[PDB]
Amino acid sequence: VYLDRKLLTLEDKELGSFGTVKKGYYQMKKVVKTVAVKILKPALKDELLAEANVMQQLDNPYIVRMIGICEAESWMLVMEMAELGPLNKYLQQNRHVKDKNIIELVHQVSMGMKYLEESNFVHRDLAARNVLLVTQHYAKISDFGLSKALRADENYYKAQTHGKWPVKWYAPECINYYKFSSKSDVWSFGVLMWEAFSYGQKPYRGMKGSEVTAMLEKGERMGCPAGCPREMYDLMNLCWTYDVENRPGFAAVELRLRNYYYDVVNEG
Ligand SMILES: COc1ccc(Nc2nc(-c3cccc(C(=O)Nc4ccc(C(=O)O)cc4)c3)cn3ccnc23)cc1OC
Ligand SMILES: [Cl-]
Ligand SMILES: [Cl-]
Ligand SMILES: [Cl-]
Ligand SMILES: [Cl-]
Ligand SMILES: [Cl-]
């Protein structure tokens, strides 16, 4: 959890800019581990410790692993590096990634989210930008800064202060009632699917969050990305069921993705 600054080596170049993120290496006794280190500039510190507390409890092949936290020139969260980075950016720069490969990756995210659902955690920022690639065929979920462990007696988290929120990824019940459940995450996952099959295009382009709400309330949903297979667009639309009760969970979604992926595999 608490790491030795002497064992961390940071590169100058930032990968991104809350703070910055930088690549580094962390020494074990016989190897070094390549790391991504989130580096802050009270509120920020509190959020980092909270995020670390959530990551600490998670153990799944499709979730980014925390190495630990470090308190030196600034506060640092140190994670196992996913070398290829955010999926949205990857797909923008790699437009000939095959449909079978996109299905493989979004299924992996679904398996990560099924685990998160079973663990009774809500992610609350599930977007393509927060899916990180280890390889072209291996995705992990990251960014647990808004994530919450559900109370033992509640199936949702009730936000109080509408913070700075990724509205275009949020279900109607999140915007209208400030209620966040694993089924809200399923909604976000449908948006993440749309982004993936759109090769990292932004959702609801040109629209204000307000117009998104109006659109969704009309019953309108985003169109099928070019080359996106029927079966996958149907699954997006099922993720975007307006009524939480009738919206599937991740067990349901993962299985549908699983079965389809095996069909696509069997073709060939
Ligand atoms: C430059 O390419 C990258 C390659 C690997 C990574 N890897 C990793 N990055 C992060 C990380 C943390 C905090 C913030 C960010 C971040 O700034 N992401 C991001 C996502 C999307 C965009 C964009 O759409 O332009 C720009 C930046 C990324 C965490 N991680 C945990 C394990 N591996 C990583 C990041 C890269 O750029 C942001
Ligand atoms: Cl250093
Ligand atoms: Cl060494
Ligand atoms: Cl909040
Ligand atoms: Cl947004
Ligand atoms: Cl599999």
mmCIF file of C-alpha atoms and ligand atoms in Angstrom:
data_model
loop_
_atom_site.group_PDB
_atom_site.id
_atom_site.type_symbol
_atom_site.label_atom_id
_atom_site.label_comp_id
_atom_site.label_asym_id
_atom_site.label_seq_id
_atom_site.Cartn_x
_atom_site.Cartn_y
_atom_site.Cartn_z
ATOM 1 C CA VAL A 1 0.000 0.000 0.000
ATOM 2 C CA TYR A 2 2.582 2.588 1.117
ATOM 3 C CA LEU A 3 5.573 2.445 -1.231
ATOM 4 C CA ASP A 4 9.227 3.504 -0.970
ATOM 5 C CA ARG A 5 10.066 6.602 -3.036
ATOM 6 C CA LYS A 6 13.685 5.347 -3.298
ATOM 7 C CA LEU A 7 12.283 2.313 -5.203
ATOM 8 C CA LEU A 8 10.353 4.456 -7.714
ATOM 9 C CA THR A 9 11.933 5.865 -10.838
ATOM 10 C CA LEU A 10 9.910 8.382 -12.899
ATOM 11 C CA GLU A 11 10.409 9.475 -16.511
ATOM 12 C CA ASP A 12 10.162 13.176 -17.472
ATOM 13 C CA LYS A 13 7.542 12.847 -20.197
ATOM 14 C CA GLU A 14 3.916 12.940 -19.035
ATOM 15 C CA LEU A 15 1.490 10.505 -20.633
ATOM 16 C CA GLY A 16 -1.380 12.820 -19.635
ATOM 17 C CA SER A 17 -2.421 15.762 -17.447
ATOM 18 C CA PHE A 18 -6.222 17.019 -11.092
ATOM 19 C CA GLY A 19 -2.524 16.356 -11.727
ATOM 20 C CA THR A 20 -0.452 14.361 -14.188
ATOM 21 C CA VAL A 21 0.209 10.737 -15.039
ATOM 22 C CA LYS A 22 3.679 9.522 -15.852
ATOM 23 C CA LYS A 23 5.380 6.260 -16.702
ATOM 24 C CA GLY A 24 7.872 4.834 -14.241
ATOM 25 C CA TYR A 25 9.434 1.662 -12.840
ATOM 26 C CA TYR A 26 9.118 0.232 -9.369
ATOM 27 C CA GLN A 27 11.811 -2.073 -7.962
ATOM 28 C CA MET A 28 10.997 -5.454 -6.561
ATOM 29 C CA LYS A 29 13.943 -7.525 -5.224
ATOM 30 C CA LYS A 30 14.772 -9.226 -8.553
ATOM 31 C CA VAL A 31 12.698 -7.456 -11.233
ATOM 32 C CA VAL A 32 11.326 -4.066 -11.988
ATOM 33 C CA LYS A 33 7.688 -3.467 -12.678
ATOM 34 C CA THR A 34 6.679 -0.902 -15.294
ATOM 35 C CA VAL A 35 4.133 1.466 -13.779
ATOM 36 C CA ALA A 36 1.691 4.242 -14.487
ATOM 37 C CA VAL A 37 1.794 6.810 -11.692
ATOM 38 C CA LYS A 38 -1.005 9.271 -11.103
ATOM 39 C CA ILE A 39 0.515 12.388 -9.464
ATOM 40 C CA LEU A 40 -1.448 15.139 -7.683
ATOM 41 C CA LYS A 41 -0.597 18.850 -7.801
ATOM 42 C CA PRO A 42 -7.143 18.140 0.614
ATOM 43 C CA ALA A 43 -10.029 17.202 -1.710
ATOM 44 C CA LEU A 44 -7.638 15.628 -4.242
ATOM 45 C CA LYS A 45 -5.726 13.661 -1.593
ATOM 46 C CA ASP A 46 -8.960 12.291 -0.124
ATOM 47 C CA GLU A 47 -10.152 11.093 -3.545
ATOM 48 C CA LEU A 48 -6.836 9.348 -4.197
ATOM 49 C CA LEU A 49 -6.903 7.426 -0.893
ATOM 50 C CA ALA A 50 -10.549 6.497 -1.608
ATOM 51 C CA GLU A 51 -9.609 5.297 -5.095
ATOM 52 C CA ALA A 52 -6.680 3.283 -3.721
ATOM 53 C CA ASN A 53 -8.968 1.739 -1.082
ATOM 54 C CA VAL A 54 -11.331 0.536 -3.840
ATOM 55 C CA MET A 55 -8.530 -0.815 -6.087
ATOM 56 C CA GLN A 56 -6.910 -2.626 -3.168
ATOM 57 C CA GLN A 57 -10.017 -4.824 -2.873
ATOM 58 C CA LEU A 58 -10.215 -5.756 -6.546
ATOM 59 C CA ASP A 59 -8.605 -8.861 -8.019
ATOM 60 C CA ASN A 60 -9.630 -9.718 -11.606
ATOM 61 C CA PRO A 61 -7.684 -10.118 -14.881
ATOM 62 C CA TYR A 62 -9.743 -7.314 -16.488
ATOM 63 C CA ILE A 63 -9.239 -4.678 -13.786
ATOM 64 C CA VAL A 64 -6.054 -2.564 -13.503
ATOM 65 C CA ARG A 65 -3.919 -3.600 -10.496
ATOM 66 C CA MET A 66 -2.823 -1.065 -7.944
ATOM 67 C CA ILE A 67 0.745 -1.434 -6.723
ATOM 68 C CA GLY A 68 0.273 1.134 -3.933
ATOM 69 C CA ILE A 69 0.448 4.795 -2.913
ATOM 70 C CA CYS A 70 3.498 7.019 -2.259
ATOM 71 C CA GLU A 71 3.863 10.342 -0.360
ATOM 72 C CA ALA A 72 6.901 12.319 -1.557
ATOM 73 C CA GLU A 73 7.145 15.605 -3.545
ATOM 74 C CA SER A 74 3.437 14.975 -4.112
ATOM 75 C CA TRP A 75 0.795 12.230 -3.626
ATOM 76 C CA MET A 76 1.157 9.372 -6.101
ATOM 77 C CA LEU A 77 -1.008 6.394 -7.065
ATOM 78 C CA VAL A 78 1.119 3.691 -8.652
ATOM 79 C CA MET A 79 -0.506 1.103 -10.949
ATOM 80 C CA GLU A 80 0.640 -1.744 -13.186
ATOM 81 C CA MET A 81 1.127 -0.132 -16.599
ATOM 82 C CA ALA A 82 -1.291 -0.932 -19.458
ATOM 83 C CA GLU A 83 1.145 -0.046 -22.188
ATOM 84 C CA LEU A 84 -1.148 0.787 -25.131
ATOM 85 C CA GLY A 85 -3.349 3.119 -23.144
ATOM 86 C CA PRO A 86 -6.939 4.293 -23.530
ATOM 87 C CA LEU A 87 -9.127 2.357 -25.927
ATOM 88 C CA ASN A 88 -10.774 5.414 -27.489
ATOM 89 C CA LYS A 89 -7.391 6.851 -28.454
ATOM 90 C CA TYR A 90 -6.082 3.480 -29.602
ATOM 91 C CA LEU A 91 -9.018 2.884 -31.912
ATOM 92 C CA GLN A 92 -8.850 6.434 -33.368
ATOM 93 C CA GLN A 93 -5.257 5.730 -34.430
ATOM 94 C CA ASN A 94 -5.877 2.105 -35.468
ATOM 95 C CA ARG A 95 -8.967 2.155 -37.688
ATOM 96 C CA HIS A 96 -8.391 -1.285 -39.261
ATOM 97 C CA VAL A 97 -8.779 -3.188 -35.995
ATOM 98 C CA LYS A 98 -11.184 -5.974 -36.923
ATOM 99 C CA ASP A 99 -14.743 -6.343 -35.758
ATOM 100 C CA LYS A 100 -13.935 -9.690 -34.098
ATOM 101 C CA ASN A 101 -11.182 -7.913 -32.092
ATOM 102 C CA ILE A 102 -13.546 -5.121 -30.886
ATOM 103 C CA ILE A 103 -16.037 -7.772 -29.749
ATOM 104 C CA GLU A 104 -13.243 -9.591 -27.882
ATOM 105 C CA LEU A 105 -12.268 -6.369 -26.084
ATOM 106 C CA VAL A 106 -15.766 -5.215 -25.051
ATOM 107 C CA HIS A 107 -16.437 -8.752 -23.825
ATOM 108 C CA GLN A 108 -13.364 -8.553 -21.629
ATOM 109 C CA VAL A 109 -14.707 -5.304 -20.180
ATOM 110 C CA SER A 110 -18.062 -7.075 -19.609
ATOM 111 C CA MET A 111 -16.248 -9.828 -17.665
ATOM 112 C CA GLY A 112 -14.519 -7.136 -15.574
ATOM 113 C CA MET A 113 -17.868 -5.455 -14.945
ATOM 114 C CA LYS A 114 -19.595 -8.766 -14.022
ATOM 115 C CA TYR A 115 -16.894 -9.170 -11.347
ATOM 116 C CA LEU A 116 -17.455 -5.618 -10.178
ATOM 117 C CA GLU A 117 -21.189 -6.233 -10.053
ATOM 118 C CA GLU A 118 -20.675 -9.469 -8.078
ATOM 119 C CA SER A 119 -18.372 -7.503 -5.743
ATOM 120 C CA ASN A 120 -21.161 -4.877 -5.249
ATOM 121 C CA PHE A 121 -19.008 -1.961 -6.418
ATOM 122 C CA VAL A 122 -20.360 0.749 -8.731
ATOM 123 C CA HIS A 123 -17.798 2.157 -11.172
ATOM 124 C CA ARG A 124 -19.554 5.427 -12.178
ATOM 125 C CA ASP A 125 -17.116 6.424 -14.954
ATOM 126 C CA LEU A 126 -17.181 3.506 -17.356
ATOM 127 C CA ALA A 127 -16.238 4.989 -20.684
ATOM 128 C CA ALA A 128 -13.896 3.964 -23.487
ATOM 129 C CA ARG A 129 -11.310 6.502 -22.244
ATOM 130 C CA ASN A 130 -11.087 4.505 -18.951
ATOM 131 C CA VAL A 131 -10.571 1.129 -20.659
ATOM 132 C CA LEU A 132 -6.809 0.630 -21.035
ATOM 133 C CA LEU A 133 -5.145 -1.866 -23.389
ATOM 134 C CA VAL A 134 -2.416 -4.237 -22.247
ATOM 135 C CA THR A 135 -2.203 -5.580 -25.813
ATOM 136 C CA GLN A 136 -4.407 -5.289 -28.908
ATOM 137 C CA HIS A 137 -6.313 -8.341 -27.515
ATOM 138 C CA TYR A 138 -6.354 -7.532 -23.792
ATOM 139 C CA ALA A 139 -8.413 -4.751 -22.122
ATOM 140 C CA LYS A 140 -8.575 -3.708 -18.460
ATOM 141 C CA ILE A 141 -10.895 -1.357 -16.607
ATOM 142 C CA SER A 142 -9.370 1.611 -14.843
ATOM 143 C CA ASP A 143 -10.284 4.908 -13.121
ATOM 144 C CA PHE A 144 -11.983 4.122 -9.858
ATOM 145 C CA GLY A 145 -12.050 7.762 -8.699
ATOM 146 C CA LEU A 146 -15.871 7.951 -8.658
ATOM 147 C CA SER A 147 -16.347 4.303 -7.637
ATOM 148 C CA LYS A 148 -18.306 3.295 -4.550
ATOM 149 C CA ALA A 149 -18.731 0.150 -2.528
ATOM 150 C CA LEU A 150 -22.492 -0.410 -2.069
ATOM 151 C CA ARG A 151 -23.878 -0.477 1.440
ATOM 152 C CA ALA A 152 -24.908 -3.952 2.568
ATOM 153 C CA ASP A 153 -28.632 -2.915 2.719
ATOM 154 C CA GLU A 154 -28.832 -0.875 -0.586
ATOM 155 C CA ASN A 155 -28.571 -1.808 -4.290
ATOM 156 C CA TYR A 156 -27.624 1.768 -5.187
ATOM 157 C CA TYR A 157 -25.391 4.675 -4.215
ATOM 158 C CA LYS A 158 -27.133 8.007 -3.666
ATOM 159 C CA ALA A 159 -25.004 10.982 -4.658
ATOM 160 C CA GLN A 160 -25.710 14.245 -2.856
ATOM 161 C CA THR A 161 -23.746 16.936 -4.643
ATOM 162 C CA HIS A 162 -24.034 16.609 -8.429
ATOM 163 C CA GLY A 163 -20.278 16.771 -9.022
ATOM 164 C CA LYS A 164 -18.483 17.121 -12.337
ATOM 165 C CA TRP A 165 -20.265 14.243 -14.103
ATOM 166 C CA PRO A 166 -19.838 12.384 -17.457
ATOM 167 C CA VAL A 167 -23.541 12.925 -18.276
ATOM 168 C CA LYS A 168 -23.403 11.371 -21.754
ATOM 169 C CA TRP A 169 -22.477 8.051 -20.115
ATOM 170 C CA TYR A 170 -25.107 8.230 -17.310
ATOM 171 C CA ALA A 171 -28.453 6.425 -17.111
ATOM 172 C CA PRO A 172 -31.729 8.388 -16.651
ATOM 173 C CA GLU A 173 -31.960 7.385 -12.963
ATOM 174 C CA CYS A 174 -28.479 8.904 -12.352
ATOM 175 C CA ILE A 175 -29.423 12.254 -13.880
ATOM 176 C CA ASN A 176 -32.976 12.314 -12.505
ATOM 177 C CA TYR A 177 -32.655 10.698 -9.051
ATOM 178 C CA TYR A 178 -28.839 10.676 -8.414
ATOM 179 C CA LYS A 179 -29.052 6.908 -7.968
ATOM 180 C CA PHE A 180 -26.129 4.758 -9.101
ATOM 181 C CA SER A 181 -26.348 0.953 -9.306
ATOM 182 C CA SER A 182 -24.589 -1.750 -11.271
ATOM 183 C CA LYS A 183 -27.474 -1.396 -13.794
ATOM 184 C CA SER A 184 -26.484 2.275 -14.263
ATOM 185 C CA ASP A 185 -23.029 0.977 -15.108
ATOM 186 C CA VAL A 186 -24.699 -1.304 -17.719
ATOM 187 C CA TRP A 187 -26.098 1.843 -19.355
ATOM 188 C CA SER A 188 -22.607 3.317 -19.452
ATOM 189 C CA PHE A 189 -21.343 0.053 -20.878
ATOM 190 C CA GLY A 190 -23.799 0.405 -23.830
ATOM 191 C CA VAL A 191 -22.280 3.838 -24.518
ATOM 192 C CA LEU A 192 -18.804 2.355 -24.206
ATOM 193 C CA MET A 193 -19.830 -0.292 -26.768
ATOM 194 C CA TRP A 194 -21.024 2.379 -29.127
ATOM 195 C CA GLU A 195 -17.670 4.236 -28.732
ATOM 196 C CA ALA A 196 -15.674 1.044 -29.401
ATOM 197 C CA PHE A 197 -17.591 0.101 -32.571
ATOM 198 C CA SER A 198 -17.344 3.772 -33.626
ATOM 199 C CA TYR A 199 -13.550 3.536 -33.279
ATOM 200 C CA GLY A 200 -13.294 6.028 -30.395
ATOM 201 C CA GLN A 201 -15.776 8.557 -31.701
ATOM 202 C CA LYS A 202 -17.414 10.621 -28.993
ATOM 203 C CA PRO A 203 -21.054 9.826 -28.192
ATOM 204 C CA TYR A 204 -23.906 12.299 -28.904
ATOM 205 C CA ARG A 205 -21.554 14.491 -30.905
ATOM 206 C CA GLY A 206 -22.489 18.146 -31.071
ATOM 207 C CA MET A 207 -25.112 17.820 -28.318
ATOM 208 C CA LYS A 208 -25.370 19.393 -24.883
ATOM 209 C CA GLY A 209 -25.999 17.031 -21.908
ATOM 210 C CA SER A 210 -29.423 18.676 -21.725
ATOM 211 C CA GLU A 211 -30.262 17.749 -25.329
ATOM 212 C CA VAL A 212 -29.051 14.206 -24.621
ATOM 213 C CA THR A 213 -31.563 13.969 -21.778
ATOM 214 C CA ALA A 214 -34.334 15.299 -23.978
ATOM 215 C CA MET A 215 -33.380 12.840 -26.772
ATOM 216 C CA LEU A 216 -33.329 9.812 -24.455
ATOM 217 C CA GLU A 217 -36.574 10.874 -22.881
ATOM 218 C CA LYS A 218 -38.150 10.975 -26.376
ATOM 219 C CA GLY A 219 -37.141 7.297 -26.755
ATOM 220 C CA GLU A 220 -34.401 8.057 -29.269
ATOM 221 C CA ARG A 221 -31.085 6.135 -29.079
ATOM 222 C CA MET A 222 -27.821 6.490 -30.945
ATOM 223 C CA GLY A 223 -27.633 4.792 -34.371
ATOM 224 C CA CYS A 224 -25.689 1.679 -35.315
ATOM 225 C CA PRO A 225 -21.989 2.380 -35.964
ATOM 226 C CA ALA A 226 -20.823 1.537 -39.551
ATOM 227 C CA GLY A 227 -19.898 -2.144 -39.763
ATOM 228 C CA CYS A 228 -21.255 -2.861 -36.275
ATOM 229 C CA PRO A 229 -23.063 -6.230 -36.386
ATOM 230 C CA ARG A 230 -26.830 -6.423 -35.804
ATOM 231 C CA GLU A 231 -26.389 -8.613 -32.704
ATOM 232 C CA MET A 232 -24.094 -6.079 -31.094
ATOM 233 C CA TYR A 233 -26.325 -3.080 -31.779
ATOM 234 C CA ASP A 234 -29.289 -4.935 -30.275
ATOM 235 C CA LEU A 235 -27.197 -5.472 -27.146
ATOM 236 C CA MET A 236 -26.362 -1.699 -26.890
ATOM 237 C CA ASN A 237 -30.043 -0.949 -27.101
ATOM 238 C CA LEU A 238 -30.813 -3.461 -24.400
ATOM 239 C CA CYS A 239 -28.163 -1.731 -22.252
ATOM 240 C CA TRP A 240 -30.031 1.535 -22.832
ATOM 241 C CA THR A 241 -33.358 0.275 -21.424
ATOM 242 C CA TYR A 242 -34.868 3.398 -19.802
ATOM 243 C CA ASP A 243 -36.389 1.425 -16.883
ATOM 244 C CA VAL A 244 -33.728 0.115 -14.513
ATOM 245 C CA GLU A 245 -35.897 -2.846 -13.505
ATOM 246 C CA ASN A 246 -36.073 -4.134 -17.060
ATOM 247 C CA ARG A 247 -32.453 -3.279 -17.897
ATOM 248 C CA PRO A 248 -30.227 -6.396 -17.744
ATOM 249 C CA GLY A 249 -27.351 -6.864 -15.309
ATOM 250 C CA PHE A 250 -23.797 -7.731 -16.263
ATOM 251 C CA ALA A 251 -24.322 -11.478 -15.867
ATOM 252 C CA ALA A 252 -26.885 -11.278 -18.674
ATOM 253 C CA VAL A 253 -24.826 -8.892 -20.810
ATOM 254 C CA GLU A 254 -21.545 -10.849 -20.448
ATOM 255 C CA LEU A 255 -23.229 -14.131 -21.458
ATOM 256 C CA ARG A 256 -24.765 -12.565 -24.605
ATOM 257 C CA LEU A 257 -21.398 -11.100 -25.504
ATOM 258 C CA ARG A 258 -19.662 -14.440 -24.736
ATOM 259 C CA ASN A 259 -21.972 -16.502 -26.915
ATOM 260 C CA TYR A 260 -21.748 -14.052 -29.826
ATOM 261 C CA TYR A 261 -17.950 -13.892 -29.673
ATOM 262 C CA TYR A 262 -17.815 -17.683 -29.920
ATOM 263 C CA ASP A 263 -20.063 -17.570 -33.018
ATOM 264 C CA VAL A 264 -17.745 -15.008 -34.626
ATOM 265 C CA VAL A 265 -14.822 -17.226 -33.630
ATOM 266 C CA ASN A 266 -16.576 -20.337 -35.129
ATOM 267 C CA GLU A 267 -16.945 -18.354 -38.361
ATOM 268 C CA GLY A 268 -13.514 -18.990 -39.893
HETATM 269 C C1 LIG B 1 0.153 8.045 -24.158
HETATM 270 O O1 LIG B 1 -0.473 6.750 -24.141
HETATM 271 C C2 LIG B 1 -0.688 6.053 -22.988
HETATM 272 C C3 LIG B 1 -0.220 4.745 -22.861
HETATM 273 C C4 LIG B 1 -0.460 4.021 -21.688
HETATM 274 C C5 LIG B 1 -1.179 4.623 -20.653
HETATM 275 N N1 LIG B 1 -1.476 3.972 -19.442
HETATM 276 C C6 LIG B 1 -2.193 4.309 -18.248
HETATM 277 N N2 LIG B 1 -2.784 5.520 -18.006
HETATM 278 C C7 LIG B 1 -3.481 5.794 -16.837
HETATM 279 C C8 LIG B 1 -4.088 7.144 -16.687
HETATM 280 C C9 LIG B 1 -4.324 7.701 -15.439
HETATM 281 C C10 LIG B 1 -4.896 8.951 -15.322
HETATM 282 C C11 LIG B 1 -5.243 9.650 -16.450
HETATM 283 C C12 LIG B 1 -5.013 9.089 -17.689
HETATM 284 C C13 LIG B 1 -5.374 9.861 -18.867
HETATM 285 O O2 LIG B 1 -5.004 11.025 -18.907
HETATM 286 N N3 LIG B 1 -6.083 9.208 -19.884
HETATM 287 C C14 LIG B 1 -6.514 9.781 -21.089
HETATM 288 C C15 LIG B 1 -7.606 9.177 -21.707
HETATM 289 C C16 LIG B 1 -8.101 9.678 -22.887
HETATM 290 C C17 LIG B 1 -7.516 10.797 -23.476
HETATM 291 C C18 LIG B 1 -8.081 11.326 -24.742
HETATM 292 O O3 LIG B 1 -9.187 10.963 -25.135
HETATM 293 O O4 LIG B 1 -7.378 12.260 -25.463
HETATM 294 C C19 LIG B 1 -6.421 11.427 -22.869
HETATM 295 C C20 LIG B 1 -5.916 10.915 -21.678
HETATM 296 C C21 LIG B 1 -4.448 7.838 -17.821
HETATM 297 C C22 LIG B 1 -3.612 4.829 -15.864
HETATM 298 N N4 LIG B 1 -3.019 3.671 -16.098
HETATM 299 C C23 LIG B 1 -3.012 2.591 -15.347
HETATM 300 C C24 LIG B 1 -2.317 1.619 -16.013
HETATM 301 N N5 LIG B 1 -1.908 2.108 -17.194
HETATM 302 C C25 LIG B 1 -2.341 3.384 -17.234
HETATM 303 C C26 LIG B 1 -1.622 5.937 -20.826
HETATM 304 C C27 LIG B 1 -1.405 6.656 -21.972
HETATM 305 O O5 LIG B 1 -1.835 7.967 -22.141
HETATM 306 C C28 LIG B 1 -2.744 8.746 -21.366
HETATM 307 CL CL CL B 2 12.989 10.012 -9.948
HETATM 308 CL CL CL B 3 16.482 -4.143 -9.714
HETATM 309 CL CL CL B 4 -20.497 12.007 -5.887
HETATM 310 CL CL CL B 5 -20.442 14.248 -20.778
HETATM 311 CL CL CL B 6 -13.497 -16.316 -23.205
#
